Design a protein around this ligand. Sequence first.
Ligand SMILES: *Cc1c(COP(=O)(O)O)cnc(C)c1O
Ligand SMILES: *Cc1c(COP(=O)(O)O)cnc(C)c1O
Ligand SMILES: O=C(O)CCC(=O)C(=O)O
Ligand SMILES: O=C(O)CCC(=O)C(=O)O
Lengths: 404, 404
Amino acid sequence: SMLGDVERFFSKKALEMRASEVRELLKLVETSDIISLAGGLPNPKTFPKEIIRDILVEIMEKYADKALQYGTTKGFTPLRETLMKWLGKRYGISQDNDIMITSGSQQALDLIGRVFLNPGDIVVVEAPTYLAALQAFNFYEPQYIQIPLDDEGMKVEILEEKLKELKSQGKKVKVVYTVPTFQNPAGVTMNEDRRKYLLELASEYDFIVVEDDPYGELRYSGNPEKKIKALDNEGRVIYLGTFSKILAPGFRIGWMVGDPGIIRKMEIAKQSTDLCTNVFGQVVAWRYVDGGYLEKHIPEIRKFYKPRRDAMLEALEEFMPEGVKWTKPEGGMFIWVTLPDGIDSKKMLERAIKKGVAYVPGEAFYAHRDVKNTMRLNFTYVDEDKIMEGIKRLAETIKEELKA
Amino acid sequence: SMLGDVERFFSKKALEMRASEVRELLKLVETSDIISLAGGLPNPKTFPKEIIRDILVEIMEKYADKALQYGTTKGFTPLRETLMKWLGKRYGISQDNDIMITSGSQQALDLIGRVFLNPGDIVVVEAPTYLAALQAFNFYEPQYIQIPLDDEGMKVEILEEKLKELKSQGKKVKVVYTVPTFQNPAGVTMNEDRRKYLLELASEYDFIVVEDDPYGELRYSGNPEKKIKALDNEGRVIYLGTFSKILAPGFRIGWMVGDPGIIRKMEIAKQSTDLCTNVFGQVVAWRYVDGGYLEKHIPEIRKFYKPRRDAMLEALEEFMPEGVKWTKPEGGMFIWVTLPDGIDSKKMLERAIKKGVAYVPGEAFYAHRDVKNTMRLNFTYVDEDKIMEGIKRLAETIKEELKA
Ligand SMILES: *Cc1c(COP(=O)(O)O)cnc(C)c1O
Ligand SMILES: *Cc1c(COP(=O)(O)O)cnc(C)c1O
Ligand SMILES: O=C(O)CCC(=O)C(=O)O
Ligand SMILES: O=C(O)CCC(=O)C(=O)O
């Protein structure tokens, strides 16, 4: 810096901000020939480019002034209306909720932090959870309580235990943040009974639930779950959806659905952070949903990713040594691996990279960074054939790591 | 709200957020046939829709995967490169600065607040200043020092006086925020001597200057000023530009240029608020600048707005009673009017609306809401002929207000 101790200008929060060492390494790995299973991106082969092209022409012919001008903070009305119609028909989400357009669900999470969190307020997350949600919330200084998952998602029973123990300390949780379907990073889905149990606790202990659902349409097997938001009679759930994996992430459009009191506050908070979400992408998304193209395209995304999931699950079963375990997602973009004998997968990544494969070490996904034997693998954006070869390389890395 | 008192969940900052009731009234005024001089929007007749259409075609042919995928937090590299080439050639901004793409300069202002401001840190603003900048910064709880403007922009003399008084109290300012060319709302421009004088203060008193410049290309008369950032030898200036009025606001793309140490921190802060600025709009903006289209389009914007500024200035001279004063902008979107005899323009707005004209009361533009006899008029987006009629109605409103 020219200033040169530029830190003398920084806020207390800025002084605690740091770039991820791991994320920097992984940026590098992506530009090389290593087989990376570390990505979190959807595959551009799933972007509906011809429908997008037709929609762009349509906008310049018919909607140019609306797409080009500033928008309201709350969002482009036709997109808000078409999304609530979609959500009600498809999922049985109630129309008495309100809806705000966001600049991605990342912006929803930042705004949830601004609107709800005072320093020291308690947020419950799953262990593991979505690392960007921890990043969003961390700016607001919450305390976290972590609730492990199993193959049926959040162990809501341990959440009841922890809520009782907090209550005995005179304390309460303010927000439970859940990614309950095809989790990033775990790949598992909260079952129906647990969704209902979470909501009874939400009532009994008076907290807000944030349900982040980027992947529910990327279902490859099994039957659709009920959204927590569709079971929400009290209006305690804030539901987040996004176009990132069902259209493309390049337009940075998502939506937040919830109690109108909560939405109204979110709108005022948003106004000062970005004025409005880009209206041009909102008009594109509106034509995409309202024109029926989202509905028609969803099966093409599923057809593309399913065999990639299945190839990875096949390779793990054939190559992984005993004592390695992994989740079996019915949808989404990730499979989550648990390593035996105390291997530290952060320490192992150096060995894996040397053997030609990368993954994201699981530690980063725990609020308390306190579990070390887990890894996130992605199947959406490796070259297919490279899924088999990448899983072999990782299996051999684990074999050698296991040798003292 | 379904939750009963939903306020029980809100953070301390959320509890202080309120919708502007002036802004609510003016929303309604816009949908009626009152002549509104209250807008802050550029005119869609200036949007380069043909060029945009060609650019969209080009992107789907050649750049679709980049435009549709997630981007890096820092921004789309070709856009960052083309902007720095543009800013160096056009303005002499130095290439040792770094650049980050933002989701509008509104997002730049929020991020400046996040990165620099602890509660109680002192921010200097002009009096008046841009209301949304006050909104962005208010979340971070600064103390403001207001420095009045004259027809040559900020009275930097008074800033030196206030910096010496604060120093005597053992205090310092952290940031001076300036809109030094065709100010929103005042329409005036800081002269060259004062730009140099501000930077001497910034060195002597050790503060950062944020230069927000959305309008410098919308110059209708006179000669181009030197950007503060072009005089900035010490790397103390963070320069904000935006495509809102030179392309169209619908893509919500801006940029922030400054010391690489400050930009690096800004990138980490932004990552948690929105992951990245919409890449699709950044590819559009890149073709727009790199293809020469921006440079070709700017004279078309100037040709459009100039006669509207001139009609409004003619109408004010012909119609306004003695003792009314207004600024004489060489550019931008606004004229700023000062009323005599202690008229309160917020109180007068009810009378103006009854007579068929609206404007924005000046009070909202003062950090300390302490001046009551000013108004912001916009000439960019009234249907022109209505500029003369609007100014006449406002002149008659002021004459009636001056009576008992
Ligand atoms: C993919 C992902 C998102 C997407 O966020 P956007 O900002 O909308 O792109 C949000 N939450 C989780 C858990 C994700 O995995
Ligand atoms: C027009 C305007 C802006 C524009 O902000 P964006 O978020 O880029 O649209 C910023 N600052 C001022 C002073 C303005 O008048
Ligand atoms: O690469 C990106 O910008 C997406 C990163 C991501 O999906 C996340 O960390 O939330
Ligand atoms: O109407 C808009 O969103 C633009 C408002 C604006 O420019 C502002 O308040 O800063």
